[PDB]
Amino acid sequence: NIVMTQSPKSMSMSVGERVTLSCKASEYVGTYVSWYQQKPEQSPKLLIYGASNRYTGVPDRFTGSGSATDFTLTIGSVQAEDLADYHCGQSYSYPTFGAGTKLELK
Amino acid sequence: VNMDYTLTMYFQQAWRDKRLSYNVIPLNLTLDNRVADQLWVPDTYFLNDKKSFVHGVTVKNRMIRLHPDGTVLYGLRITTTAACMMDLRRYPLDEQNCTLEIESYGYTTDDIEFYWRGDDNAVTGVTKIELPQFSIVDYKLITKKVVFSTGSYPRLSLSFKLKRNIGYFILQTYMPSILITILSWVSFWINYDASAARVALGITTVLT
Amino acid sequence: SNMSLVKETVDRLLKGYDIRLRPDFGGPPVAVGMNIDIASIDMVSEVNMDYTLTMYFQQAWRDKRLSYNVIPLNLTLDNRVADQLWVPDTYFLNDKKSFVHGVTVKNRMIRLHPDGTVLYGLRITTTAACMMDLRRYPLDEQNCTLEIESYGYTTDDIEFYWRGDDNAVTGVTKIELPQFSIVDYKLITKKVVFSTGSYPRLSLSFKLKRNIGYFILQTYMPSILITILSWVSFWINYDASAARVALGITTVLT
Amino acid sequence: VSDHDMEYTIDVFFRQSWKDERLKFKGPMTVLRLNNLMASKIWTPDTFFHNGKKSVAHNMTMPNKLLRITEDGTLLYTMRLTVRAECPMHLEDFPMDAHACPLKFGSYAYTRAEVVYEWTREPARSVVVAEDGSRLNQYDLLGQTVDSGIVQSSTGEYVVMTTHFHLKRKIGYFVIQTYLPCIMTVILSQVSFWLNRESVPARTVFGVTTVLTMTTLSISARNSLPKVAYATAMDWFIAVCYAFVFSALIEFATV
Amino acid sequence: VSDHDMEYTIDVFFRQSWKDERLKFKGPMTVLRLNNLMASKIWTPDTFFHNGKKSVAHNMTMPNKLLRITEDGTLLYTMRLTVRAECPMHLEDFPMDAHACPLKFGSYAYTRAEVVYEWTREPARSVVVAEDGSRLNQYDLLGQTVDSGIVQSSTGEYVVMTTHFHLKRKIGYFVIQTYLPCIMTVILSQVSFWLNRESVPARTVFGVTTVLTMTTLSISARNSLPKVAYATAMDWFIAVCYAFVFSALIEFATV
Amino acid sequence: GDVTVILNNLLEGYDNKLRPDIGVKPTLIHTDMYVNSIGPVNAINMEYTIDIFFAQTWYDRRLKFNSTIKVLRLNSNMVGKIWIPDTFFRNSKKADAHWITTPNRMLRIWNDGRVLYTLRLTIDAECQLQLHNFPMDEHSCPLEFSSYGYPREEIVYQWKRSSVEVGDTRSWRLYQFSFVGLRNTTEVVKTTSGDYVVMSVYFDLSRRMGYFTIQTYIPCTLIVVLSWVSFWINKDAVPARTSLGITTVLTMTTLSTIARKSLPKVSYVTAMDLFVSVCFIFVFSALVEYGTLHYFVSSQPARAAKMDSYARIFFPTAFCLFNLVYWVSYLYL
Numbered sequence A: 001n002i003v004m005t006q007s008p009k010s011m012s013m014s015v016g017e018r019v020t021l022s023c024k025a026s027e028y029v030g031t032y033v034s035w036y037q038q039k040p041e042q043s044p045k046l047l048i049y050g051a052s053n054r055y056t057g058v059p060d061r062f063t064g065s066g067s068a069t070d071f072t073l074t075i076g077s078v079q080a081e082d083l084a085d086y087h088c089g090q091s092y093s094y095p096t097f098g099a100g101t102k103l104e105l106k
Numbered sequence B: 001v002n003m004d005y006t007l008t009m010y011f012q013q014a015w016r017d018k019r020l021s022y023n024v025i026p027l028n029l030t031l032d033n034r035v036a037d038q039l040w041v042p043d044t045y046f047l048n049d050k051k052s053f054v055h056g057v058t059v060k061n062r063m064i065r066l067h068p069d070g071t072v073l074y075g076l077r078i079t080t081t082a083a084c085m086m087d088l089r090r091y092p093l094d095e096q097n098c099t100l101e102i103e104s105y106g107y108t109t110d111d112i113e114f115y116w117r118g119d120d121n122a123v124t125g126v127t128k129i130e131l132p133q134f135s136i137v138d139y140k141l142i143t144k145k146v147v148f149s150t151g152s153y154p155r156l157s158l159s160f161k162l163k164r165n166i167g168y169f170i171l172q173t174y175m176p177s178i179l180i181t182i183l184s185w186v187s188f189w190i191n192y193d194a195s196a197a198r199v200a201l202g203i204t205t206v207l208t
Numbered sequence C: 001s002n003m004s005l006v007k008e009t010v011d012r013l014l015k016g017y018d019i020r021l022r023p024d025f026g027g028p029p030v031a032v033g034m035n036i037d038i039a040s041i042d043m044v045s046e047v048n049m050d051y052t053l054t055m056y057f058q059q060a061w062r063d064k065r066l067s068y069n070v071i072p073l074n075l076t077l078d079n080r081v082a083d084q085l086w087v088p089d090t091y092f093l094n095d096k097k098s099f100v101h102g103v104t105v106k107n108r109m110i111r112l113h114p115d116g117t118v119l120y121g122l123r124i125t126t127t128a129a130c131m132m133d134l135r136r137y138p139l140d141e142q143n144c145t146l147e148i149e150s151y152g153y154t155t156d157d158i159e160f161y162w163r164g165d166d167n168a169v170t171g172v173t174k175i176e177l178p179q180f181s182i183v184d185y186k187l188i189t190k191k192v193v194f195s196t197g198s199y200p201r202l203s204l205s206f207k208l209k210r211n212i213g214y215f216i217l218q219t220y221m222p223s224i225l226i227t228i229l230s231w232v233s234f235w236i237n238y239d240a241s242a243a244r245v246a247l248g249i250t251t252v253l254t
Numbered sequence D, E: 001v002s003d004h005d006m007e008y009t010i011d012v013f014f015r016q017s018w019k020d021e022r023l024k025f026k027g028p029m030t031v032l033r034l035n036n037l038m039a040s041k042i043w044t045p046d047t048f049f050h051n052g053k054k055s056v057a058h059n060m061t062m063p064n065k066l067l068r069i070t071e072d073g074t075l076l077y078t079m080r081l082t083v084r085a086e087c088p089m090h091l092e093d094f095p096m097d098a099h100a101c102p103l104k105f106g107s108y109a110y111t112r113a114e115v116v117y118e119w120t121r122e123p124a125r126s127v128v129v130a131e132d133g134s135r136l137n138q139y140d141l142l143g144q145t146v147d148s149g150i151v152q153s154s155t156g157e158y159v160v161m162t163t164h165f166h167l168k169r170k171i172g173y174f175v176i177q178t179y180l181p182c183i184m185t186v187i188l189s190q191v192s193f194w195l196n197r198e199s200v201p202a203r204t205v206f207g208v209t210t211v212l213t214m215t216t217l218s219i220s221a222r223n224s225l226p227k228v229a230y231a232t233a234m235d236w237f238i239a240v241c242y243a244f245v246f247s248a249l250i251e252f253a254t255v
Numbered sequence F: 001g002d003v004t005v006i007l008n009n010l011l012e013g014y015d016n017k018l019r020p021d022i023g024v025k026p027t028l029i030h031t032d033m034y035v036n037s038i039g040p041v042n043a044i045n046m047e048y049t050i051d052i053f054f055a056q057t058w059y060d061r062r063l064k065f066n067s068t069i070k071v072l073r074l075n076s077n078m079v080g081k082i083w084i085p086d087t088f089f090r091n092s093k094k095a096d097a098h099w100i101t102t103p104n105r106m107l108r109i110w111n112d113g114r115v116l117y118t119l120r121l122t123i124d125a126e127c128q129l130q131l132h133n134f135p136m137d138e139h140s141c142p143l144e145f146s147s148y149g150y151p152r153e154e155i156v157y158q159w160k161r162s163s164v165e166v167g168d169t170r171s172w173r174l175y176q177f178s179f180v181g182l183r184n185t186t187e188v189v190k191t192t193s194g195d196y197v198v199m200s201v202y203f204d205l206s207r208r209m210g211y212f213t214i215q216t217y218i219p220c221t222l223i224v225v226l227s228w229v230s231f232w233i234n235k236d237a238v239p240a241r242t243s244l245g246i247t248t249v250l251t252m253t254t255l256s257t258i259a260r261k262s263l264p265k266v267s268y269v270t271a272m273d274l275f276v277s278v279c280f281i282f283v284f285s286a287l288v289e290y291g292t293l294h295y296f297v298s299s300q301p302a303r304a305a306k307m308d309s310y311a312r313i314f315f316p317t318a319f320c321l322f323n324l325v326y327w328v329s330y331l332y333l
């Protein structure tokens, strides 16, 4: 059972600043890590399918970086619509997700 | 060294095709071997082979033969190099089982059924095989069904147990080593004052 | 246009063409002229008693059915038309494994001339067989030959000759063998007789002379040196027996 | 003739003649010397070699096949092909042995009641070997021997045409390779009997180096022939020579 | 695994599946398990192996292919073939090295915007190696590892599916071949230090004999591994053992 | 669909036996290569393996269609239905395409009639290696190609500006050699059938002396020092020095013979034969020097006393001077 550890557990950030999210796997997951975004009282939406591939309908400010175990999701010019939770999940085996990181504004 | 055995065989298959049924003429029909490219023949294959071919001299060595009730007989002359992994922990005093696996590729067990025609006398010519190194002690025929992710397939298995001869290995390796080991005992019969003689003898035996 | 004219010419030439019959099937024999452009001689093996050579093998004859007069140029066609034309059944009698190269397509050439002359070239790698007389090895010379014969057609159906008769075989002065050196080569025309008839035969024979430079520095110099190192024991006195015996026996072992 | 595979190679013009009443014609020619592509549109017999291993029918530059049809319906069909056949050998008298390597052919799928074979000339004059056609390095072809018989298999009764080529091995290679080094090593072991007993290392290194040379000769000599389980005549010679060398060393030990 | 050629062999059932809406039907059967000659009349993907050298697709007795068409239009297409793929090895820790031999396949002629590949099951469960499926004598298969990526060529981007097989070399052969004889030869050199100082030829032939066998050991041990231009672990072991034997002989010379 | 009607309209009245512009002008073919790997360069058969992606491009005015799609991207199914040039490699001993799992070929036809045809090839090309200075040698041996049947007046080849591209250069099968660069060439050669435009790609290779070093240069020098150690042994122990010298001679012979099996059966002296020859000579001279020493201690002792002390300094200096002159003379070339 591949466990994904996501960091940090909670973060705060203002508008128009670079932000970096990390996901670390216990075992090998090749490039089958996906990043989902979930706003409150909504269903999760796939942002990055595979390591470093944007889904259809995602802005060009989200970009992923992959490896065998270490994965990153970076947002560039952050607007006021990136106030959501972000989950990383692996698909090399039976899928397991991360804990999530709630971005807040301060 | 390659972990394989080459065998030549006359491999014949017999089934019944109700479309190839005639009753105007009363005799059996041996047709030219090129009409087998216009009939249905089963897609039999050997799972453990490495290289195989049908002999093609002076023509393609295959046989087609029809019967008035519908039965088709289809023979080939096949030389195949099948892969048997050997356990050489007792070499050369060993006995190895080398098996030709015979399976159907496309048709599952709900489309085709395999059986040995006779179930013990289906394979002939084993007792007349002479090998320079081995000796066929026993052979067995086995019917089976294997299961893959695509379905269940019929399988036949022809396994031969081969026992290795020892006389060559005796005269090649066992007798020279024993003779050098007796020869290396003459160092004690030489007196212990002469040093160069005993060193030359012992060292020569070790090098040999 | 010109493409339409050539298209109708090729379509007229190939319509009603019988590949079973040679040119002049009831009349005089057809004359086929040979050129060989030797690309390399690969490996002259003494243990297998054969040699390997790559060649550009060209045959020229005249077929009146493939004659045209509406266009003034020579027609180089795609090599797939060689399966729709008659080509002679030339074979090599002393070959062991031959093939036509096949990258990127089948390496052959088919060219039609307006007077009916067909030019047909192949690129072959032949492993021809020759028995060598190694009684004077390595100070020996070997005549190794490629025999060229017609299989089906007898001498009253086909006729062979060399195109030029002295310059029909080129590229022999550029062959670089690592162990031999070509001193001379000959072209021979004759007829052989089998129980089925008389057949024309051409013969391209090469004389290969073996060098000595490797054999000297590998066998002749060491053996002489070891004999001198066996002679050195005469300068050792007869008292020291162990030294002289060890020296002699180890020169024998070397 | 490969001795380690127990096989041999042969290159033949293989001719077959038969009569087809459906191919009668009447024209300005009495024999049609046709191509090798008309033979694939008519019935030709399916001859195979019973003891062939990997044969090749040459097709350079065209398929080396010949078809001649005579106006009364007689066909001559000739092929040029290289056959690699099995020759089961008994190497008790190696390397002074004589073999009869066989070459058996017949029809695949056509029994005796359908297709029968025959020699076209007298059986002693049918299989003809050329004079310059001999790629034998190690053997000597003495003669040929044909035969005819009837084999019986699981598909019916078949006609089998047998040919035997009688070979006699040449000893001149194995002499210099094995028999003369063994005699040289035995005489070199027997040289030691003329040295004086006050030189113990001399006779010791004599004995041990000739035993080493005999061991090297035995291992290097047994790789020529296949891995048979019985003793040959070279094995007996090597064994007696090894016994003589070892006996010379044991006599030195006793002295 | 052929270390001398930097390659390995693998026998696979290679299965592909896609959806073709032009092959929909409605009949009594829900799946047509057709022949291997129907797959030539329809479109099939042109998968090739990016690191395959000379692969074979078996044709005995019939073409070992499988085509199944389901009523809704999905096609399953299976082949049986022997891949001979390239495995680049870094033999610096030989013979105590581990490797990850790749097997990359993708589409020829169809870019990423035309044909994409994917595993039919979970990526950890898609490449399945059989239990009795191991012809390895020198290595040990530890597991598999798949991945998927994109290659950027001169004609577009192409999907590439990667599979790594992890191997671990077994030391049991090289121990008995080289590392135990080197140790025994070094011990044989060191036993010369116990002979008396009055036996000068004895210790001389000890030292020089050990040097000769170390030389023959190093030549016999280098010919297994391919001709790389660097030093492995076995080379360092043989170098230090040769240094020990040579140092023993120079010590005898000084004594 | 629409691609089916376009493909069916392109192949009506089409003759794949005739090149485009059969009586107008020669056909211009643009060629590209991508070397995936340069395989093992074995000198025994004077050859080397190479794996390439060969791409050709030309213009065919018969494959010109009007449609809303710009390019037809096809498999190898239609390669045998249009005209394909008869490119062949002139210096290849054996060459094959790839057929697993489907013929590795690609055809792309454009809106104006431009055809691009790519296929994967593995060539076993031929190049005569002048194996002097071995193993400190450098080679540059080619891969040439041209049309087989079409002369200069019918087919003209031409490189692009980004013609030949190598890959990673680290996953290549070059054990004993090292890739240094490449250069392209175009020429016209006279042949019995006509004048042909031939294009060459020369790969420059340099042999890295890392295997032959630890195989022959270190052990032969070690055996020479082994023969040297006989001088410090006492001059009275005659069997010791004789056995040492002659067994050292044995080791030199065996090492020389096992070392010459790498390179082909060339008849000239290389830079490796000279080294092992001089090492054998050195061992020969050491043994013959001890022989003359043992004769001279019995004939006259005044000359044989200081001969060994002279040898102890003359042999290493002569060998070191030989090594210096040899290495500079063969690394300057």
Ligand SMILES: *[C@@H]1O[C@H](CO)[C@@H](O[C@@H]2O[C@H](CO)[C@@H](O[C@@H]3O[C@H](CO[C@H]4O[C@H](CO[C@H]5O[C@H](CO)[C@@H](O)[C@H](O)[C@@H]5O[C@H]5O[C@H](CO)[C@@H](O)[C@H](O)[C@@H]5O)[C@@H](O)[C@H](O[C@H]5O[C@H](CO)[C@@H](O)[C@H](O)[C@@H]5O)[C@@H]4O)[C@@H](O)[C@H](O[C@H]4O[C@H](CO)[C@@H](O)[C@H](O)[C@@H]4O[C@H]4O[C@H](CO)[C@@H](O)[C@H](O)[C@@H]4O[C@H]4O[C@H](CO)[C@@H](O)[C@H](O)[C@@H]4O)[C@@H]3O)[C@H](O)[C@H]2NC(C)=O)[C@H](O)[C@H]1NC(C)=O
Residues within 6 Å of the ligand: C100, C101, C102, C103, C106, D059, D060, D061, D062, D063, E040, E041, E057, E058, E059, E063, E064, E065, F076, F077, F078, F079, F080, F081, F095, F096, F097, F099, F100, F101, F102, F103
């Ligand atoms: C002396 O005798 C020798 C023995 O007979 C003889 O050798 C033979 O030479 C001929 C001619 O050179 C060879 O024929 C061609 O082979 C081409 C492919 O070749 C290579 O592959 C074969 C095996 O053939 C199989 O595999 C390919 C690729 O998968 C298949 O496409 C083939 O159909 C065939 O498949 C069967 O077998 C497979 C298992 O092997 C099965 O998996 C499969 O399902 C099939 O059952 C190898 O044997 C070759 O090895 C040899 O040659 C190389 C040369 O360098 C050597 O190095 C090597 O060592 C071997 O010697 C080689 O690997 C075929 O593509 C080709 O078919 C085409 O062209 C002709 C002429 O135009 C057409 O009539 C024919 O229909 C084929 O055309 C179509 O397909 C092509 C594909 O590229 C399309 O481009 C084209 O448009 C056309 O499409 C049409 O038909 C399609 C259906 O077929 C349809 O879908 C399309 O829509 C369209 O309508 C031809 O068969 C023959 O293989 C050699 N055999 C052997 C054993 O060597 C030698 O030449 C003789 N010498 C002399 C001097 O006489």
Ligand SMILES: *[C@@H]1O[C@H](CO)[C@@H](O[C@@H]2O[C@H](CO)[C@@H](O[C@@H]3O[C@H](CO)[C@@H](O)[C@H](O)[C@@H]3O)[C@H](O)[C@H]2NC(C)=O)[C@H](O)[C@H]1NC(C)=O
Residues within 6 Å of the ligand: B037, B038, E037, E059, E061, E062, E063
């Ligand atoms: C692999 O096995 C298959 C089937 O066993 C082989 O296919 C057979 O190939 C031959 C050669 O093309 C076919 O013969 C031909 O028939 C056509 C008519 O369709 C005719 O025009 C040709 O002149 C030729 O006579 C034969 O029908 C075909 N058999 C089947 C069942 O499709 C294939 O050649 C094998 N490949 C190798 C490399 O061994």
Ligand SMILES: *[C@H]1O[C@H](CO)[C@@H](O[C@@H]2O[C@H](CO)[C@@H](O[C@@H]3O[C@H](CO)[C@@H](O)[C@H](O)[C@@H]3O)[C@H](O)[C@H]2NC(C)=O)[C@H](O)[C@H]1NC(C)=O
Residues within 6 Å of the ligand: B097, B098, B099, B138, B139, B140, B142, B157, B159, B160, B161
């Ligand atoms: C050589 O090795 C093969 C491979 O294991 C041996 O084959 C095995 O043979 C036995 C006896 O025939 C089979 O056991 C039988 O199982 C059936 C189950 O249906 C049972 O009804 C019988 O009572 C019997 O126990 C076994 O299936 C078979 N193994 C395989 C995988 O085929 C073979 O016996 C060995 N020896 C020789 C001389 O070939």
Ligand SMILES: *[C@H]1O[C@H](CO)[C@@H](O[C@@H]2O[C@H](CO)[C@@H](O[C@@H]3O[C@H](CO)[C@@H](O)[C@H](O)[C@@H]3O)[C@H](O)[C@H]2NC(C)=O)[C@H](O)[C@H]1NC(C)=O
Residues within 6 Å of the ligand: C143, C184, C185, C186, C188, C203, C205, C206, C207
């Ligand atoms: C290497 O050996 C071959 C075969 O032995 C030599 O071929 C022979 O060439 C000679 C003269 O070139 C031919 O002899 C001549 O016969 C004609 C009529 O038959 C006669 O008018 C002449 O007086 C002369 O005797 C002979 O036909 C030919 N032998 C065969 C069977 O081809 C060849 O010359 C040798 N040398 C080289 C380097 O080619």
Ligand SMILES: *[C@@H]1O[C@H](CO)[C@@H](O[C@@H]2O[C@H](CO)[C@@H](O)[C@H](O)[C@H]2NC(C)=O)[C@H](O)[C@H]1NC(C)=O
Residues within 6 Å of the ligand: F159, F160, F161, F163, F182, F183, F184
């Ligand atoms: C490959 O060939 C091309 C042309 O044959 C070479 O191209 C030229 O490069 C020089 C500068 O290096 C330019 O001035 C020329 O104009 C280029 N030619 C063309 C036609 O544009 C190219 O350098 C060659 N590549 C090599 C030798 O590696």
Ligand SMILES: CN1C(=O)CN=C(c2ccccc2)c2cc(Cl)ccc21
Residues within 6 Å of the ligand: E049, E050, E051, E106, E107, E108, E109, E151, E152, E153, E154, E155, E158, F034, F036, F053, F167
């Ligand atoms: C980057 N690259 C090229 O540009 C040449 N063509 C490509 C390719 C060509 C056709 C289909 C898929 C991929 C290729 C294939 C390999 Cl195995 C390695 C490098 C490479």
Ligand SMILES: CN1C(=O)CN=C(c2ccccc2)c2cc(Cl)ccc21
Residues within 6 Å of the ligand: C216, C217, C218, C219, C221, C222, F252, F253, F254, F256, F257, F260, F272, F273, F274, F276, F277, F280, F281
């Ligand atoms: C067979 N042999 C030896 O015995 C050692 N000395 C010789 C030699 C020694 C002196 C002069 C010429 C040749 C030599 C040289 C080579 Cl390059 C390979 C094997 C070999």
Ligand SMILES: *[C@@H]1O[C@H](CO)[C@@H](O)[C@H](O)[C@H]1NC(C)=O
Residues within 6 Å of the ligand: B026, B027, B028, B067
């Ligand atoms: C046909 O074969 C069967 C068995 O193979 C045999 O019983 C029968 O007699 C044969 N028919 C004729 C007419 O001989």
Ligand SMILES: *[C@@H]1O[C@H](CO)[C@@H](O)[C@H](O)[C@H]1NC(C)=O
Residues within 6 Å of the ligand: C072, C073, C074, C113
């Ligand atoms: C055709 O080839 C012949 C033979 O060399 C030559 O004389 C003639 O000029 C060629 N025709 C053309 C148009 O080039």
